[PDB]
């Protein structure tokens, strides 16, 4: 398993990460995490908001007790404070940053978090204030690196000016390439790592809806992998600074995802994949 530098501050992760969200039957969740590590995945992603009352963080914390903590990069997050009919409410006051961090440390049962993200931006608090408390947490050793998720270009730039941002987590896949026009270039200018979430799930849902397409399947066959591996490989190929965090609850799919790292695609291969996604009469439909 290759390792890559995520951002410029010193974080180093496995080229493929693992999203723990979906896991929240405990023994079996722990077993998936342990097998991911046995496959060389060291980067594990969660958030305070996943599971019930932080049960996903608790799960990861239990799994960690069976692993070498210092070999693993734990990413978690804070910021979503309530969810209701009216929608999601974010909070980014310094007191909340600190209390969320402490609660996550306790649920994960760790002395530090590697990568701590603002999960959702608080549009009522200047981002400098939130980042200021995150800077204090870095200086105290409570967290090592700071991430953002779903942030505007203006928020990214202003955040980074206060304390360097290590990663941006955003949706990115063959089916969702909005970040390419402005976000990707900006992250590259600032040295910020890119962490795609839903690198395969939206495509899987689509594949299922359309099933109940062939160009993608024929390209996967051509490249000796499955359609999902091709999708994940495409994301993997978008840069040395791109680390996707697909989730799964199944060991077989975990092994499939790891297998996607084997796929090698040329610039031309990549365009062909992108371009595909905007007896006498014994014939078949053309590709
Ligand atoms: N190799 C694979 N083949 C088929 N489905 C897979 C897969 N890897 C992950 N998934 C599914 O893809 C989903 C996860 O996709 P994702 O990580 O891109 O995130 P998201 O839920 O945000 O879409 C899960 O539904 C997962 O289901 P399983 O737990 O049954 O695996």
Swiss-Prot record:
Changing residue 119 to A: 98% loss of activity. InterPro entries: Aldo-Keto_reductase, NADP_OxRdtase_dom, NADP_OxRdtase_dom_sf. The active site is at residue 50. NADP(+) binds at residues 198-207. Optimum pH is 7.0. GO terms for biological process: alkaloid metabolic process. Optimum temperature is 50 degrees Celsius. Substrate binds at residue 119. Signal peptide: none annotated. Pfam families: Aldo_ket_red. Gene3D superfamilies: NADP-dependent oxidoreductase domain (3.20.20.100). It catalyses: raucaffrinoline + NADP(+) = perakine + NADPH + H(+). One of its GO terms (molecular function) is aldo-keto reductase (NADPH) activity. Its EC number is 1.1.1.317. One of its GO terms (cellular component) is cytoplasm. The keyword Repeat does not apply. Keywords: Alkaloid metabolism, NADP, Oxidoreductase. The keyword Oxidoreductase applies. Belongs to the aldo/keto reductase family. Aldo-keto reductase involved in the biosynthesis of monoterpenoid indole alkaloids. Broad substrate specificity enzyme with a high selectivity in the group of alkaloids. Can use perakine, 19(S),20(R)-dihydro-peraksine-17,21-al, cinnamic aldehyde, p-coumaric aldehyde and 3-(3,4,5-trimethoxyphenyl)propanal as substrates, but not ketosteroids such as progesterone. NADPH could not be replaced by NADH. This is Perakine reductase. The lineage of its organism: Eukaryota, Viridiplantae, Streptophyta, Embryophyta, Tracheophyta. The gene is PR.
